[PDB]
Ligand binder design. Structure first.
Ligand code: NAI
Ligand code: NAI
Ligand code: NAI
Ligand code: NAI
Ligand code: GBD
Ligand code: GBD
Ligand code: GBD
Ligand code: GBD
Lengths: 315, 315, 315, 315
């Protein structure tokens, strides 16, 4: 029987996710939200695309937490997108902390009761904090919950480099680790193009170090760039989440960078941080530790310290 | 070289269209709008999905009409979604008439100048009126412009019946003609399930005539149902438009119900109305005239009369 | 975890099936055959396409019946393609009877022992006979075993008509029932184009009755036409089988014409015959009985009588 | 209008290619061969899959060279698969030289006359020799003709490593250069897993150097392994060719290792050899030169020397 996918939060990212799930025929979808009627409306609209897509996925709205019962995958976007009061210039994910904390606790209790065996993907910011909080309150095993970060951050870095080099976007591979936010760690040493070290393209003057520095800055500030032009990013975040959910559902075993519980990797324990993992039928099947140098490790440490700082304020 | 697809209007439907184009690798996309910066922001967000989708489609924003130059396909959603002043209870597509008319004229002039050989899909309501107005002002051949209607309306009818019968949505086929709006003509006689007349399923008590009447009413009022729950429909409309655009771009020759210039079919000329057409490389390759009975023709006439009434008020 | 799909028979059709399964990422594949080493060779070749296809399906060869253990779907092509001694001019599926009978019994015993809960698709000719024999010896429920016939036969009829009318092949729908072989029943009354009765296109002189008669004859004799040009058909048969297997695996609920146990439909019981069925997670979820007229019923009876004649000779 | 793809040679690889083209709706297909009727038979069988695939690609057979007229892409598999007289134990691509040389000249003349603007992919062995011969006789620009090699060879290396590491096959990237045959150059230094250097996985004892040496040997001898089990490889070769053809047709700009004219790269000129190239709308858009060390260069030189040796014998 089809997988049951519950989207806890039916806002902008939730809507794109439901659309992409039907396009890919991935499973039945529940759009859950605290807002009355809205999820039912989005679900109805989305359900009709089964015709155009040649798919057969139910799409239903919900205002009832117990509809989590029987969930195979739960995706959590519930929460605030901006500190009610701060300008778009001064956004920052850190300010979402006080707004989204209590929400993870409430959701965690309902997961523990209704679907303790579900695979969980957390999106709510600041994600590296929120994911651990949900882990602690839902009681699920460490191999069954991850947070969105690296797939999204690297899509931007990969894309921008592919534009400069005039190659297929997917042919650029790259790693961003530690945390999802302004302290994200961009690993220049681990960038490849068609499996070839980026340094060879730099040596050939096909792309310069200065151009790469500008792309790095653009990558870190992308969410901000989009807000200064439109609104909180939702299309690419949704596509990133679905790539993760799909790897689990279809046992693809893709290597994808996500927030996961660290147990000594990079010298860190008792905290979640971004690192390449392998996602398949058993959830997080492997946690891959990059063999970072001391300079890279120092930056990783800065990222973890910021997650810890915000974790303390959420309590 | 890739097709160039210009979305004239970068609102809700435009955003889903850009997303679906990248998912399907259909061509380069321009999100054009009169609103400053917003299209650039949506384009940036959407562009990153090339990575997750294994695609290579440029996505760019625009505030400049001359970016229509070189367009292979132009999709027009530009306009108003609601009479600024009327409640959601009392919506009606007819009220969008005074709000969207001048916009078609302006767009038509820019198409004539920049991309006279493009294939045009009109979405702005009331669509059967707006499409003819754009046809007259853009100067394009009758085989190169159509309006959205039947693919969207029938997706709802097909979906609702498939739910009751527990079969694949695409396996239900159905026809709604005349016009897109409250006078749409639902043809009960032309419904099939797996290619089998629906009447056989009625004879077998698998679905009743009364159940079908309720589905018919729900179908006509779907846009209203969604607004009373959320907002103007955008996900299914977008998927319907892309199915049409894809048939053209890839020379699929799909039979799809769209608004097209009538030249004697059903007894009507000099007006656009909804009817099955074949869409391929040469645009509207065939206009199919259903052999309607007198009772069905009477309803078709009512639909055309309403298009004519609104056409007169737009002038 | 991924579905396990065992192909009992690794000849021409088995090879295309394995290829298509990897293309669609449908599940792990076992190519089983009595021929030593050959299945291992085909499996190795096919396994490499996971790279090009972005898939992750194991493909393994087997010469051991107990590898049926854990099978979710079993597809049976094992047997003879031609009476060793008869020319290509005089082929006939009936002559395969004495060559393939004992093989179904042997396979059935291994299914009963190793995978009694698997969904079975039988291909070996004459299929309407062989499928019932396998049903009786494997002990599986009637909703869990079907035979290939109508999806393949109608693909030809649909294709040939689409060529004449210049429309998308999938837009032509049609029904062929009773049995797969020279007595197949072509139902002219149940042909549609874009959901529209074919008779309307005949009335419009877009296709004539005489042209349709020629297409009907070509359809019945297609296997023979291909043999007189090349060899036993294998590419379309494989695609037809995979469409069936996919509907089951992904709970699509497609209406597809297949050989299934009749329990009074068309007046027949205790025999398998071709009729539209709905295929989903629970196997044959629905058996649809077409409301045939007496002339059509007479032809259906002729088809069943031929299945019965050959059934008797197989015993 | 749809691309026209002519398969010059309708044997085993040609058949899989036609099937995959229809699955992907890539363009119209002509199966050309010198064997009477056979291509027509395969074309007929394959054409029916348009129904199951939701595609609309014509598939036609041909025994007439002038059907090359209007070709957008030409794929050449025409020739011998084995020296008529040598055992399967002692195969070797070198022995195909005397059997396939005159065939390239004949085909080249017909291309120059009928489709001088087509993009050409050469498969016939020994490929690095045959591709240059076809280049010289067809008169096409150097950016419009390539040979199959690295995409196929690396699929095996990538696959075998992915099996050991339990990750998605596509997540392993690797490079094999110089020539397609027993002198292929496997570059251990350029292997990555999820974009991470393979050496990190070796350091972590997840895979050993000894295991990699065995995989390397298996990779070079794969064609032989399959023949000792079944027959000349055809499924993966076909998938590799289609990935190349698709990158061209859809302007994907994928980095793919293929045989191309060298003009100083690696110190070599006036010969074709395997190296990463970028394939898009303009054919070979970029030729990428790996920054090989002296030890790797020495092996590249050995590969080129073997191509030169056989080139001389073909004249
Ligand atoms: N991890 C990452 O890489 C990214 C994280 N995000 C974060 O994801 C979150 C969602 O983003 P959007 O969808 O754009 O926001 P949105 O505001 O459009 O949607 C959030 C929805 O959650 C609902 N909600 C509030 N409490 C709830 C509860 N208890 N249960 C269910 N629903 C509840 C709200 O009514 C709202 O509809 C934000 O915190 C954003 O910062 C956004 C992009 C990327
Ligand atoms: N034909 C059909 O079956 C359907 C038609 N529609 C109609 O499509 C239209 C668009 O719907 P949505 O995208 O939801 O509305 P929306 O309001 O979200 O987007 C409309 C966009 O057009 C822009 N615009 C205004 N004048 C313009 C101009 N001269 N050039 C370019 N852009 C301009 C606006 O700034 C706005 O961003 C509405 O009229 C709606 O009624 C909606 C659903 C179905
Ligand atoms: N139902 C339908 O619409 C169609 C049915 N067919 C039938 O399907 C059958 C297979 O066709 P092809 O693949 O082209 O034939 P094929 O001859 O290429 O393959 C048959 C394979 O079965 C193997 N085999 C024999 N006994 C076996 C056993 N006990 N267990 C496992 N394998 C065994 C043979 O070694 C051979 O490799 C034929 O009977 C053909 O008539 C073919 C096309 C359509
Ligand atoms: N480059 C690579 O990585 C690989 C190359 N190959 C080579 O590709 C070639 C084809 O392989 P298969 O399809 O398995 O062989 P095959 O023997 O099944 O097909 C070759 C076909 O070419 C036909 N032919 C002969 N002369 C012709 C002409 N003048 N015009 C058109 N057709 C002609 C033959 O009748 C035959 O049907 C072989 O040389 C093989 O060694 C095979 C695998 C990989
Ligand atoms: O990175 C993003 O796209 C983003 N938008 S709002 N919150 C985020 O993490
Ligand atoms: O039918 C619709 O989905 C619709 N929403 S607003 N305007 C429309 O025609
Ligand atoms: O119908 C067919 O394609 C066929 N080829 S051999 N046996 C068959 O039923
Ligand atoms: O490498 C191969 O798959 C092959 N089979 S025969 N000739 C070849 O190059």
């Amino acid at each position: 029987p089809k997988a049951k996918i519950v989207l806890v939060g039916s806002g902008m990212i939730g809507g794109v996710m439901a659309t992409l799930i039907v396009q890919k025929n991935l499973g039945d979808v529940v759009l859950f939200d605290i807002v009355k009627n809205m999820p039912h409306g989005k679900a109805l609209d989305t359900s009709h695309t089964n015709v155009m897509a040649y798919s057969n996925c139910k799409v239903s709205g919900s205002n009832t937490y117990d509809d989590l019962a029987g969930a195979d995958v739960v995706i959590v976007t519930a929460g605030f997108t901006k500190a009610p009061g701060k300008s778009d210039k001064e956004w920052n994910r850190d300010d979402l902390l006080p707004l989204n904390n209590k929400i993870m606790i409430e959701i965690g209790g309902h997961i523990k009761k209704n679907c303790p065996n579900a695979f969980i993907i957390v999106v709510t910011n600041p994600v590296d904090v929120m994911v651990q909080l949900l882990h602690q309150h839902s009681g699920v095993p460490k191999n069954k919950i991850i947070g969105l970060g690296g797939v999204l951050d690297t899509s931007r870095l990969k894309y921008y480099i592919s534009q400069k080099l005039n190659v297929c976007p997917r042919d650029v591979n790259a790693h961003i680790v530690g945390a999802h936010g302004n302290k994200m760690v961009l690993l220049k040493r681990y960038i490849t193009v068609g499996g070839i070290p980026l340094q060879e393209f730099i040596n050939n003057k096909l792309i310069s170090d200065a151009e790469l520095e500008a792309i790095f800055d653009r990558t870190v500030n992308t969410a901000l760039e989009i807000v200064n032009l439109h609104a909180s990013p939702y299309v690419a975040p949704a596509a990133a989440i679905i790539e993760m959910a799909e790897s689990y559902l279809k046992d693809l075993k893709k290597v994808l960078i996500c927030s996961t519980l660290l147990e000594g990797q990079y010298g860190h324990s008792d905290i979640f941080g971004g690192t390449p993992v392998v996602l398949g039928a058993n959830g997080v099947e492997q946690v891959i530790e990059l063999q970072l140098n001391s300079e890279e490790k120092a930056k990783f440490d800065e990222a973890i310290a910021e997650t810890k700082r915000m974790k303390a304020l959420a309590h």
